[PDB]
């Protein structure tokens, strides 16, 4: 869960 | 800063079956004249596990936009379960809508997303294999992520 | 790739 959250974030502001 | 600012985005018929098109009601002003389209796109994050995964559920070209206010619907059919991990499709994942100029991406709304079963019965002993006609989609319209970038507006 | 009009 807190990993998949860091990834989803990642998405959010990415590039 | 950026020729055009979006105000506000309403997620319409929010908590839908999984299969129900998105709607969004997107309103953006636009300081003056545009040369060209301004593409606005929406994604699905099939994965978390990785971007290869993503959906562009649909893209349009808004073209010629004057320097006023404007509002317009952006509807998109629901994702292809067919490429969507299974272990992915129920729980939480995020739909993005993107605007773009010129091939350029300047603003990035993104909400996360829910998609639950709603019988107890499936909660409670999920299907082996995601039943997504079975699926609630819950977009958490309270809390967007905005994230801007800069682009040539030349 | 596909147009839409403002309203």
Known sequence: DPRRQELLEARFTGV | ???????????????????????FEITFECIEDLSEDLEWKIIYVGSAESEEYDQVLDSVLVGPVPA???????????????????????????????????????????????????????????????????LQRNILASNPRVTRFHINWE
């Open chain 2, 68 to 134: 006023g206010r404007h509002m317009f619907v952006f509807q998109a059919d629901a994702p292809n379960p067919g490429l969507i991990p299974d272990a992915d499709a129920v729980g939480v994942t995020v739909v993005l809508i993107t605007c773009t100029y010129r091939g350029q991406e300047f603003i990035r709304v993104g909400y996360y997303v829910n998609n639950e079963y709603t019988e107890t019965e499936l909660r409670e002993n999920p299907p082996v294999k995601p039943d997504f006609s079975k």
């Open chain 2, 1 to 23: 800063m950026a020729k055009v600012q979006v105000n506000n985005v309403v997620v319409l018929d929010n908590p839908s079956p999984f299969y129900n098109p998105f709607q």
